[PDB]
């Protein structure tokens, strides 16, 4: 724990708010690997899985805030997939309670928040790889011969198939990424990167990082989900994001900037204009007459 916590503490880096900036290509460096290749010290012995998950969450909180999603996924793979069940095995044998203690119930809940965010990122990564693969429509040759017209029919009648297959995969990926982004934006009771055990110990590095990650990640996922829905023509669901963001169950309006609530009202209006020029009301209902 001291090896891992000293390596967690080597960053004399306060969470500045200018570094919202579009840094590019910020991949896993040697100073990130010396924090991926530190979780092993709590994974060699099963009696440390709870601490491996608590400190693994702390290093994932740093990498996710640093936009190093792959370095956070490298730490998520340093945590073995049995560990949530092993943290219950270590409770029922020996004069403990029904869940493992209040630091660790909150830590399992936090690791489940981090997994749901990695699901909501990788399904977006594959949706985005696929969306950019779009079959190019066969260009019309000027004044073409009979042979070149048959050699345009036998291109367009392949584009009809390729684009039909490509959209048949796009609408499926658009359902999966939409499950994952709703699982994070509507995450259960307390919500994403919030605790439940008020009987837990204070870590103010953890609590600050979680309140920060709710403000980096949840607005960003709403801007991604609006863009997924809008670029696929799902324009009324793009508007239901307003009632989700204002919802008193999840209070997502407390984690946006005022300028980003204004950016969201600007993007909501993009879908509202596409519904209007489709022949629907500003909210996507029928223009009855």
């Amino acid at each position: 724990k001291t090896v891992v916590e000293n390596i967690r503490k080597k960053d004399n880096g306060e969470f500045s708010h200018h570094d919202l900036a579009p840094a590019l290509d910020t991949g896993t460096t040697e100073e990130d690997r010396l924090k991926i290749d530190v979780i092993d010290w709590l994974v060699f012995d099963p009696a440390q899985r709870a601490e491996a998950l608590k400190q693994g969450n702390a290093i994932m909180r740093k990498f996710l805030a640093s936009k190093k999603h792959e370095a956070a996924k490298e730490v998520f793979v340093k945590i073995p997939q049995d560990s949530i069940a092993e943290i219950y095995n270590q409770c029922e044998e020996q004069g403990m309670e029904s869940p493992l203690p209040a630091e660790d119930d909150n830590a399992i809940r936090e690791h489940l928040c981090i997994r749901a965010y990695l699901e909501a990122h990788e399904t977006f990564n594959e949706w985005f790889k696929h969306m950019n693969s779009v079959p190019q429509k066969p260009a019309l040759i000027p004044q073409p011969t009979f042979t070149e017209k048959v050699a345009h029919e036998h291109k367009e009648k392949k584009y009809e198939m390729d684009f039909g297959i490509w959209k048949g995969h796009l609408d499926a990926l658009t359902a999966d990424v939409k499950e994952k982004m709703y699982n994070v934006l509507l995450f259960v009771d307390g919500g994403w990167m919030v605790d439940v055990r008020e009987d837990a110990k204070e870590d103010h590095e953890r609590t600050h990082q979680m309140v920060l990650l709710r403000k980096l990640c949840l607005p960003m996922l709403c801007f991604l989900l609006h863009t997924i829905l809008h670029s696929t023509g799902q324009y009324q669901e793009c508007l239901q994001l307003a009632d989700m963001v204002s919802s008193e169950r999840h209070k997502l309006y407390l984690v946006f900037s005022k300028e980003e609530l204004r950016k969201l009202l600007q993007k909501l209006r993009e879908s509202s204009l596409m519904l209007l020029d489709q022949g629907l009301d500003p909210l996507g209902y029928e223009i009855q007459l």
């Binding site: 239901q240 009632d243 204002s246 005022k258 609530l261 969201l264 909501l268 509202s272 209902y285």
Partner: protein, 330 residues
């Protein structure tokens, strides 16, 4: 001083100007229809010639050349009475001080120009007015409040006025939460859809929650059905006390007041009843049962109870629980 001759000669002129120029327009002679319509101010044939050529630059020239003649106010009617909606809102800022004065007759579209002007303080109130007027679709009233509240959370209101309008809207969210939380079986058995049903008044929400089809109705739905009595105006022809009686009678008709195996205390056995669980809620939530409840005489003179109005075990156990829970507050 000769106005009765004038306005009839002006209508004779306006009709014959349209009769003579509309063939030049419909034969596609958009240079010749417009050389006369620019000389004689035929704003229909000028605007028609623009949409029939998508010539938004000649249209914006007319909105600058006939500004002294209200051509933009004419054009905003021309985009309404038959229309395409995006082209009305996507106009230059130099005509927004005219578009807003046309949209003062079109509240259902004015908020889209208020937001496009960044007058978010108006857009809040316009969307709240439209939410109050939206009785026809529950999901549209919710979306109008959701957009109104997101305008108030983006306008430079002072912290006091912002807390006023947050709370005024939070009570309309609390009211609509009673319609949002209708059981999925009650909705399915009545074949209702939250996305397409109207907004319901408090007596109508009460009437749904307490009905026979709520074959899961409990101490939460029979708490909502009492709390909905606090959302009724003094001009409905409805005795709130007879609703309060009928709610409590229908709670008592969900509870099984049949006799046990003769070994068992009726103040212990009553603690699983939904009637006792709503009394325990009213007590926990701070209410005086000595003032809030109907008389045990006249809850027994209400006819709704039907079969229970002949049951002396119900007669005893109702009285024993009223005695226990009201003399428990003195």
């Amino acid at each position: 001083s000769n106005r009765e001759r004038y306005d009839n000669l002006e209508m004779e002129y306006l009709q014959k100007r349209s009769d003579l120029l509309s063939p030049l327009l419909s034969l596609g002679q958009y240079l010749w229809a417009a050389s006369l319509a620019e000389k004689y101010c035929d704003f229909d044939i000028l605007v028609q010639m623009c949409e029939q050529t998508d010539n938004q630059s000649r249209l914006q020239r007319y909105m600058t050349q006939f500004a002294d003649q209200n051509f933009s106010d004419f054009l905003f009617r021309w985009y309404l009475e038959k229309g395409k909606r995006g082209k009305l809102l996507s106009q230059p800022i130099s005509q927004h001080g005219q578009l807003a004065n046309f949209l003062q007759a079109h509240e259902h579209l004015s908020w889209l120009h208020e937001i496009n002007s960044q007058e978010l303080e108006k857009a809040h109130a316009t969307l709240l007015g439209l939410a109050n007027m939206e009785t026809r679709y529950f999901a549209k009233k919710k979306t109008l409040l959701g957009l109104s509240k997101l305008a108030a959370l983006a306008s430079d209101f002072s912290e006091d006025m912002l807390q006023e309008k947050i709370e005024e809207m939070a009570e309309q969210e609390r009211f609509l939460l009673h319609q949002e939380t209708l059981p999925e079986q009650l909705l399915a058995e009545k074949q209702l859809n939250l996305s397409a049903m109207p907004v319901l008044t408090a007596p109508q929400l009460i009437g749904l929650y307490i009905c026979e089809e709520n074959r899961r109705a409990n101490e939460y739905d029979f708490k909502k059905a009492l709390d909905l009595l606090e959302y009724i105006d003094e001009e409905e022809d409805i005795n709130i006390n007879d609703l309060k009686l009928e709610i409590l009678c229908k709670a008592l008709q969900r509870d099984n007041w049949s006799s046990s195996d003769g070994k068992d205390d009726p103040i212990e056995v009553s603690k699983d009843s939904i009637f006792v669980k709503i009394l325990q809620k009213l007590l926990k939530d701070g209410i005086q049962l000595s003032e809030y409840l109907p008389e045990v005489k006249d809850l027994l003179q209400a006819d709704q109870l039907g079969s229970l109005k002949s049951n002396p075990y119900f007669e005893f156990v109702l009285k024993a629980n009223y005695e226990y829970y009201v003399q428990g507050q003195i």
